[PDB]
Paper text:
NoVs recognize specific glycan ligands as host attachment factors or receptors for infection. NoVs interact with HBGAs or other glycans through their capsid protrusions that are built by the dimeric protruding (P) domain of NoV capsid protein (VP1). Genogroup II ([name]) noroviruses consist of human noroviruses (huNoVs) that generally bind histo-blood group antigens (HBGAs) as host factors and three porcine norovirus (porNoV) genotypes ([name].11/18/19) that form a genetic lineage lacking HBGA-binding ability. In this study, we solved the P protein crystal structures of a [name].11 porNoV (VA34) that was isolated from pig caecum contents in 1997 in Japan and a close-related [name].3 huNoV ([name]) that was isolated in 1977 in the USA, representing one of the earliest huNoV isolates, focusing on their HBSs compared with the previously known ones.
The crystal structure of the native [name].3 huNoV [name] P protein was solved to 2.6 Å resolution, revealing P protein homodimers in the crystallographic asymmetric unit. All P protein residues were modelled in the electron density map, except for 13 amino acids from 295 to 307 in the B-loop (see below), due to the disorder of this highly flexible long loop. The [name] P dimer exhibits a typical NoV P dimer global structure. Interestingly, VA34 and [name] P proteins share the longest B-loop compared with other [name] NoVs, leading to the observed disorders in the crystallography and thus the unknown conformation of 13 and 12 residues of this loop. The two P proteins also share the small T-loop with an α-helix extruding out of the flat surface (Figure 6(C–F), Figure S3). The [name] P protein bound secretor positive types O, A, and B human saliva samples weakly with optical density (OD) readings up to ∼0.4. All three P protein mutants with a single-residue mutation at the HBS wiped out the HBGA binding capability to all type O, A, B, and non-secretor saliva samples completely or nearly completely, indicating the requirements of the three amino acids individually for the structural and functional integrity of the [name] HBS.
Author numbering:
A (entry chain A): 224 to 293, 308 to 538
B (entry chain C): 223 to 295, 308 to 538
C (entry chain D): 223 to 293, 308 to 538
D (entry chain B): 224 to 294, 308 to 538
The structure:
């Protein structure tokens, strides 16, 4: 039986599993009034990926495909391939192509092309996940660009940079988009998570994304960092119980700072009340202690 | 009871470039006798020691943070960047590294997006280029210069740079095997990771190759790394003791259950194969590298 | 007509040192054959061109502003330097270092102060070792040392210079310039060294005795020209008719001249005197421009 | 007849005339509910110093004198004050207090330093409480407070001002003159108070934000004219042809005029503005004299 382990990583050595950016802080909040069903960064403790989660850190909210013709007022239609470059099969039991953004808003980035004659071009672009032509489950999506310099029918890649909404309220990180437009409803979704113990809230790995304009704070929370996605997938260690007891330890000090539950479906809960950051020392790290049952009472923070 | 050395089980489509935040596109071998191979990113020993400017975060390779200002003296607008380490400290040049971790390790222009968020929460982001051959590219001294087409940048504001691809006009301006001058022309490069080369007849370096995006021109954007970023992270975590200077590795197809080729994974973090000429090494989509055994340096690899 | 050259009418007790924010204490002459006098603050041409790290504000000499981050005065702090603007200093300007940067080897003693966005404040004594390997002002940073640990990181910090803070006198070398870029590169864009170009002449200095936080340091600091002359020449920019302006120290009570001196175009004075000696002046006397002369003019001794 | 001129100075090239710090901004405000009578930085346009105003930028809120013992900043010390030039202070002089005495109520935070005949030196943080009953500089003495007990009695002592040192913001009152003679008598020989005298006009202030040793004090200090103007007018002594000089802030980058103001004979400015508000100026702009004018001039609103 292979033991369960966490990688030894510092707050500044973790990457967001819903975006190609580093983790900036730890955060907690009540979550009764939101649905926490993100589809990227979703993995079980025994290394089973769920939702649209994949392994490549740079490919979260990115895409590959072929461009066609349809202030960012130039509209382009993207026929989506898999991030392999292999053709995307909508019949596959997944909500959308792996790496598809799992929130409502506009993903700001750069679309680039390389033609057979070796000519190239790349310009800023936005992916509106709220538009009726955001149908990646059907195999296509729409980008908008400020530039007209794009050649139709050429292979196109998208590099995510941050959020590109105009008003803060258009970015809702806890509202899944319609992966099929309004043709049909979302399917094959990774389960939604919630704390299930009195006085416990979710613990989030928080990033602040770049913003192309407006006053969007670009706050994106993920349940588990991308390195844990990659680590559990490699290890595939059998989950002994539903809950893993984890502790944040300071190697400078020897002291433990707080304890937490790491649940089998891939999320963390702590004993705290209110929307608040969790300030941690620069050398601290999460450490696996043992398998424990859901009725464990954590020391409050 | 000696902790065994391992490679993560990753297919070709599951690896990331360690010199740029992009997926690996192919495997490639090439003669390098006439060139010096000394990249500074993606440099790790098999027992988990990072070298050069290598760090763990995949997105921070060729990215930077700091404070933007207008420079003292078609991408026209010039901006000066006082460089911060990732934690938000200013970069202290007294540290024994060639440059801030993740600083580009090639000659050319890095094309990306510079973004700002002001204390009153106003934001902006526009395309930008980092010329690593500019005389004001002195990251070791704590500064660099970006070029932009837009003028919408507030000075004295925190600024991030996300790298997307090459930005040179003429393909020959991108020299992936030519180091930049980390201190400009004021002093020489320091604390470099050592250069690598095959030390056996009939052997060539094996590269993990990516085709970076390009903002224009005919640049193929070819970037070779010695080792994927996932092996950098894995070896750092494992730190398994290196039994010898060479680890024998085999590329196995798990459906066939048969090895396609074998290679030497050297202790300093680079691979060699028994092959002559510049050529891609095509592999099945489910194949992956596997550690076979520690060997002596004079082990003879099967050809190809 | 041609705009005439003038000196401000100022008494000895109405002049400020141009290398430190203190009043001028006395006049002094000294043989300088075996040293290189090349100070960077208080460097101005007679026709109003500033040189070195010289600027106009008297309080900003050996002061600085920036952001403090962490790194018996035993607490070390990293200072990311800003211009008086608030924006980081650009190392690409053709100056030796940020304007006002100290131009001597030793420790500057002062007070570092902070004011945070929530309006909370703190201030404590600090020292600036201009010989430290981490004194890299030209690169945009330096290292302060404090006895108090009460300093918030990532907060705007000012430094008010008070005086010397060396332990033994020999650490203070007023005529030894620091390495503005640490040991990464050598000093550049320096104002030229100065020396008398005539037999029997010595440099004339405006001398101040800086406060000292401890030890036996005399705190002696000599500037070539007071800060008021820096500000005056910059405003007037009168054309220099020759390389030497004859200048006379006059007593307005008695109407008599006490001595004469050469005010050179590069911005320094020489007198016909031998040996290390103070120059005693009446409390109401002052320098006054007499005429432009040729370099081979012979000053009356003393 | 010598014409009246202003020095060509930028916002960032001006010093506060009530404290040895640079000017940070321009400000305006209604002043009906305060007495604007501040004694430092008081000069007439024809070059006459008033109040406790002197020439040296570093000596505002500073003192020289002899220290002796008397009775957290625990240690109390008595200062027998000399003049800033080391000359004995005469309380019969027709001035409010020794030149450079603070002209506000609060605590001046700085460093007291000593150098002894045997060349031993000390320097530590110190505060001058101008509201204390033993703050009697007109009588020739004040009291400092220190946290360090390392001071030698009967030794020459200097004081370098750094900023404010009150605990609560309300202790610092920049528009309340201290009692230069304690409560033994009232203030004498004061520079006159100023106020706008035209409809829609308010005073224009040169504003700095002083460092603070603690608490949440904003350390905001307003002066009527910058110290460089005090020095320039003293040098020029140009005849004031009328009571009001018309002055315009011009942008050399664009050649355009941004606002105009009245510069009054007693040394203060008024603008056509309403409400407490900063006056934002471009970095290269400067004040330019236009002509002499009468008090009934109507300024263009801002």
């Amino acid at each position: 039986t292979k033991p369960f382990t966490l990688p030894i990583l510092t707050i500044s050595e973790m990457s967001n599993s819903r975006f190609p950016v580093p983790i900036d802080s730890l955060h907690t909040s009540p979550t009764e009034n939101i649905v926490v069903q993100c589809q990227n960064g979703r993995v079980t403790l025994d290394g089973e990926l769920m939702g649209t989660t994949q392994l490549l850190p740079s490919q979260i909210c990115a895409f590959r495909g072929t461009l066609t013709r349809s202030l960012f007022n130039y509209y382009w239609h993207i026929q989506l391939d898999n991030l392999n470059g292999t053709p995307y099969d909508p019949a596959e039991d997944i909500p959308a192509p792996l790496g598809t953004p799992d929130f409502r808003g506009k993903v700001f980035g750069v679309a680039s092309q390389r033609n057979p004659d070796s000519t190239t071009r790349a310009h800023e672009a936005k992916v509106d996940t709220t538009s009726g032509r955001f149908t990646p489950k059907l195999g296509s999506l729409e980008i908008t660009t400020e530039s007209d310099d794009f050649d139709p029918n050429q292979p196109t890649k998208f590099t995510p940079v941050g959020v590109g909404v105009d008003n803060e309220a258009e970015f809702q990180q806890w509202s899944l988009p319609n992966y099929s437009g309004q043709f049909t409803h979302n399917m094959n979704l990774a389960p939604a998570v919630a704390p299930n113990f009195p006085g416990e809230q979710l613990l989030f790995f928080r990033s602040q994304l770049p913003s192309s304009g407006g006053r969007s704070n670009g706050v994106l929370d993920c349940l588990v960092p991308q390195e844990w996605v990659q680590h559990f997938y490699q290890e595939s260690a059998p989950a002994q119980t539903q809950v893993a007891l984890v502790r944040y330890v300071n190697p400078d000090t020897g002291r433990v700072l707080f304890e937490a539950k790491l649940h089998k479906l891939g999320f963390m809960t702590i004993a705290k009340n209110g929307d608040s950051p969790i300030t941690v020392p620069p050398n601290g790290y999460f450490r696996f202690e043992s398998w424990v049952n859901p009725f464990y009472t954590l020391a409050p923070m």
